[PDB]
Ligand binder design. Structure first.
Ligand code: MG
Length: 364
């Protein structure tokens, strides 16, 4: 006998360039928590249902988890774009959702059953602009690019644009693209002709990486900031040596000294031979929220005896009140399901000259 928790993430499509890192974190969490006895002796069972890359696939995954798989709660989905369409399904069904990495403005406001462990674009994105200005105080002109078909990218670009203005910089252009585009010659050239000192990109991984590469190919030599959708080593294959120097804000640090992070990091490094990515840590933290909430609930009200609809409602109520020492640091929730989290960072892509290998170097 086990307690089923649904994991609805992008395991296929180009969205899996982000989703697979989340899956990795969730699987590490399952072993970590089950090795500690699960929920007061009862193992959890993560049930994975692939969302693919669109809204319909996410809705289908959620409905399957809720109805067929009888899950007590869902971790997911990968994208804010997917969350805005699918989360209302879970809200209506009174099934809790904990988003690992969705950072668009407005997600917890979807309803009483929607929470997230990822701080939103408003507190994550500005740090990377500040980091760029530290590395080059003479930046004056900024070109901004965003994926106009993606909800998170639109939310993130608004924050980047406001930060550029607040830092007293000149916004020379805002260029639009689609996440499904591979060619950006026209937008890149448009921006390059305006002589920017800094370029900021809000898109996802394949698109963001292709744009970074093309900017460099077309002769751009200035600074580049990538938003959260580019925050994966999966971009390395796309821009290769030309990824070098890209600045990306982080909501997780491998070097954070929390005991659980040490355990998580050690488990990750031993398996994957590199530091745990943000998306992996965030997924771990979302599973942790469910495990620790289930334990607290079970102690007060034995879960094996609670019928499913009431169990879901009580679990949702419980998780919102909890305090969690996670790989992301000590976190909790506001009454609306927004995360409370203290520390943020910026890292910079450092590629080896040959372009076949790289890493994220954390700025001090
Ligand atoms: Mg909420």
């Amino acid at each position: 006998n086990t307690i089923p928790i649904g994991i609805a993430l992008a395991q296929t499509s180009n969205v899996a360039l982000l989703g697979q890192e989340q899956v990795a974190g969730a699987k590490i969490a399952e072993k970590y928590f089950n090795d500690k006895g699960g929920v007061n002796g009862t193992p959890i069972k993560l049930i994975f249902q692939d969302t693919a890359g669109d809204e319909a696939g996410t809705i289908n995954a959620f409905q399957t988890l809720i109805n067929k798989d009888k899950v007590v709660g869902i971790v997911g989905p990968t994208l804010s774009q997917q969350a805005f369409s699918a989360n209302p399904i879970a809200e209506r069904a009174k099934v809790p959702v904990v988003g690992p990495s969705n950072t668009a403005k407005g997600i917890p406001e979807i309803g009483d059953y929607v929470a997230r462990v990822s701080a939103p674009v408003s507190v994550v994105a500005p740090n990377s602009v500040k980091a760029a200005l530290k590395q080059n105080p003479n930046i004056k002109k900024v070109a901004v690019f965003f994926a106009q078909n993606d909800a998170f990218s639109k939310s993130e670009t608004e924050i980047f644009q406001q930060t550029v203005k607040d830092q007293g910089l000149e916004l020379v252009t805002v260029q639009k693209f689609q996440t499904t585009d591979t060619d950006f010659q026209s937008q890149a050239t448009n921006a390059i002709n305006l002589k920017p000192d800094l370029v900021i990109i809000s898109g996802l991984a394949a698109d963001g990486g292709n744009l970074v590469r093309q900017l460099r190919e077309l002769g751009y030599q200035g600074a580049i900031i990538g938003g959260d959708g580019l925050n994966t080593s999966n971009v390395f294959a796309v821009c290769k040596a030309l990824c070098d120097g890209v600045l990306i804000a982080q909501a997780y640090s491998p070097e954070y000294t929390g005991e659980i992070n040490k355990a998580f990091r050690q488990a990750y490094v031993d398996q994957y031979k590199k530091e745990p990515p943000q998306f992996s840590a965030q997924a771990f933290a979302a599973v942790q929220v469910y495990v620790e909430s289930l334990k607290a609930l079970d102690t007060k009200n034995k879960v094996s005896k609670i019928q499913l609809p009431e169990l879901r409602t009580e679990l949702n109520k419980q998780l919102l009140t909890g305090k969690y020492n996670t790989p992301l640091g000590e976190i909790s929730f506001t009454p609306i399901g927004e995360v409370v989290q203290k520390d943020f960072y910026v890292a910079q892509i450092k590629m080896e000259k040959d372009g076949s290998q790289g890493k994220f170097t954390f700025l001090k």
